[PDB]
From a paper:
DprE1 is the first of two enzymes that catalyze the conversion of decaprenylphosphoryl-β-D-ribose (DPR) to decaprenylphosphoryl-β-D-arabinose (DPA). In its natural context, DprE1 catalyzes the oxidation of the 2′ hydroxyl group of DPR to give the ketone decaprenylphosphoryl-2-keto-β-D-erythropentofuranose (DPX), with flavin adenine dinucleotide (FAD) acting as the oxidant in the reaction. After BTZs have entered the catalytic pocket of DprE1 containing the reduced form of the flavin cofactor (FADH2), which was generated by oxidation of the substrate, the nitro group of the BTZs is reduced to nitroso which can then form a covalent bond with a nearby cysteine residue (Cys387, Mtb enzyme numbering). We obtained co-crystal structures of Mtb-DprE1 with BTZ compounds 1, 2, 9, and 12 and BOZ compound 5.
Compounds 4, 3 and 5 are the benzoxacinone (BOZ) analogues of 7, 6 and 9, respectively. The BOZs have an oxygen atom instead of a sulfur at the 1-position of the molecule and these were synthesized in order to probe the potency of the molecules relative to the BTZ counterparts. The kinact/Ki values of the BOZs (4, 3 and 5) are lower than the BTZ counterparts by 7-, 4- and 31-fold, respectively. Unbiased difference density maps, calculated with phases from structure models prior to incorporation of the ligand, demonstrated that all five compounds formed a covalent bond with the active site cysteine (Cys387). Substitution of sulfur with oxygen at the 1-position (BOZ, compound 5) preserves the overall mode of binding. With oxygen at the 1-position, the ring structure is more even, and we observe a small upward shift of position of the keto oxygen compared to the BTZ compounds. The conserved mode of binding in the covalent complex contrasts with the weaker inhibition (in terms of IC50) of DprE1 by BOZ compared to the BTZ sister compound as well as their differential MIC values (see assay section). Thus, the structures of the covalent complexes appear to represent ‘inhibitory endpoints’ that do not correlate with the different apparent IC50 values between compounds 5 and 9. For instance, the planes of the BTZ scaffold of compounds 1 and 5 enclose an angle of 15°, with the other three compounds in between these two extremes.
Numbering used by the authors: 7 to 268, 284 to 314, 331 to 461
The structure:
């Protein structure tokens, strides 16, 4: 039934060997669980999706890893209720293609579409529209959770069972296996964005641009971000903000099929500085999805009010010797009821660090400042933080652990991450 396999997160670090069940039969899955809750606890069981999480939340070395990608049935889409009803194994790319013809848009998209619905919920993923749409769990209207006791619970965000619902959202698969869910989609008349591009010269004007209230005019906003140049160049950004185009705004060629889809010498001179600023500055640019959308991935958010502390963390980063080219910055909006949900209103930033000597000790310092300044790290990007740091970052973890205690008293569900962060 099972196959012992060598599993890594997307970052390809910290491998561990687990027995991997990979069946489309919801029965075998329910039974493989009781075949684990019968032998005491052992090393338990964790669900796995498309394995895009960099962390170790979808590994369970010496235990059972259940691959959910065979469960990829889209059961129904309804354009009137905007409800979509899918198996946890369907990915967001599959789902986006199926829903477009109904005038429905996936409400939260991450930077890769090869992500299951299970994973989208379990990490409570965010995207470029967080400040307007919240994260993924805000759009889940119901889900079917295979619990440790073998029963299948129907959860909804309100009424009774809300607590277990909101613990499963961002629960990293540690309340049990999500089998099926209903998502409320976002209505759209096209598959296109209208985008305004902006460029900044300093971290100061980047913050100002995100504080002047202009942000309330776009549903989608993010930025490429300079983490290398010394001040005051440091933290200049190419800002890309937009919203879904109506049909009226499409060029005539496209207005027929609105829901479709398919380094030089100058580069560092004053001319390319002129090129980069000119090409990064635009208005009303219509773009499709793909146009608009040995390393250590590191992402954190700092509460909105601690802006000076945010600027200081950026300073620490560029003066650290560790250089990062791909940096995305965004202002998150309001959070949700999930105790372990990563997003809070404030300054979010994703950096990519070339693995080299001293990096591990340096990021441990970074952790310390992020913690100190009231922010947190993201489990879907994280493999190396500590339980003390995690627990302090997420003050509601105790609230969460209790809920999990009820629904899995015998530690049927476990992972490399749960043991490391002491969420088990
Ligand atoms: C290039 C790239 C860009 C990314 N951009 C973003 C981004 O912009 N925003 C963002 O939030 N994230 C981003 N991510 C991270 C990614 O969206 C999340 O880690 C996501 O959870 C991955 O989904 P998955 O299906 O691969 O799940 P996996 O990585 O296989 O599993 C992740 C977690 O979900 C749990 N899980 C999976 N299936 C189930 C289930 N059926 N029931 C219960 N639990 C389950 C697993 O146990 C594990 O804890 C990015 C990743 C990559 C590689
Ligand atoms: N950071 O990794 C990050 C953050 C955000 C958001 F704005 F939502 F906060 C969005 C991201 C995105 O859309 N894509 C990516 N990637 C980075 C550069 C590393 C992995 C590749 C993708 C393109 O990151 C985002």
């Amino acid at each position: 039934t099972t196959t012992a396999t060598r599993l890594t997160g997307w970052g390809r670090t910290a491998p561990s060997v687990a027995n991997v069940l990979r069946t489309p039969d919801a029965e075998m899955i329910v039974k493989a669980v009781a075949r684990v809750a019968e032998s005491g606890g052992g090393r338990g069981a964790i669900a796995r999706g498309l394995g895009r999480s960099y962390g170790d939340n979808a590994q369970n070395g010496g235990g059972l890893v259940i691959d959910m990608t065979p469960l990829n049935t889209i059961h129904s889409i309804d354009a009137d209720t905007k409800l979509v009803d899918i198996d946890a194994g369907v990915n967001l790319d599959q789902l986006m293609k199926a829903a477009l013809p109904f005038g429905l848009w996936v409400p939260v998209l991450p930077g890769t579409r090869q992500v299951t619905v299970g994973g989208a919920i379990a990490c409570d993923i965010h995207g470029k529209n967080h400040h307007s749409a919240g994260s993924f769990g805000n759009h889940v209207r119901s889900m079917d959770l295979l619990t440790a006791d073998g029963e299948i619970r129907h959860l909804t965000p309100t009424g009774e069972d809300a607590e277990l619902f909101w613990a499963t959202v961002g629960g990293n698969g540690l309340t049990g296996i999500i089998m099926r869910a209903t998502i409320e989609m976002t209505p759209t008349s096209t598959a296109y964005f209208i985008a305004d591009g902006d460029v900044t010269a300093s971290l100061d004007e980047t913050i100002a641009l995100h504080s002047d209230g202009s942000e309330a005019r776009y549903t989608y906003s993010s930025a490429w971000f300079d983490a290398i140049s010394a001040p005051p160049k440091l933290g200049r950004a190419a800002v890309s903000r937009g919203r879904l185009a109506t049909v009226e705004q499409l060029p005539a060629k496209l207005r027929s099929e609105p829901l479709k889809f398919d380094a030089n010498k100058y580069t560092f001179g004053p001319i390319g500085e002129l090129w980069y600023r000119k090409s990064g500055t635009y208005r009303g640019k219509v773009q499709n999805l793909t146009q608009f959308y040995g390393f250590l991935q590191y992402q954190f958010v700092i509460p909105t009010e601690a802006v000076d502390e945010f600027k200081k963390i950026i300073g620490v980063i560029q003066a650290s010797g560790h250089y990062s080219f791909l940096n995305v910055f965004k202002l998150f909006g309001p959070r949700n009821q999930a105790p372990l949900s990563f997003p809070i209103p404030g300054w979010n930033i994703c950096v990519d660090f070339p693995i080299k000597d001293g990096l591990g000790k340096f990021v441990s310092e970074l952790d310390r400042r992020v913690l100190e300044f009231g922010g947190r790290l993201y489990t879907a990007k994280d493999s190396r933080t500590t339980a003390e740091t995690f627990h302090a970052m997420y003050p509601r973890v105790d609230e969460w652990i209790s809920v999990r205690r009820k629904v899995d008293p015998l530690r049927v569900f476990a992972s490399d991450m749960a043991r490391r962060l002491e969420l088990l």
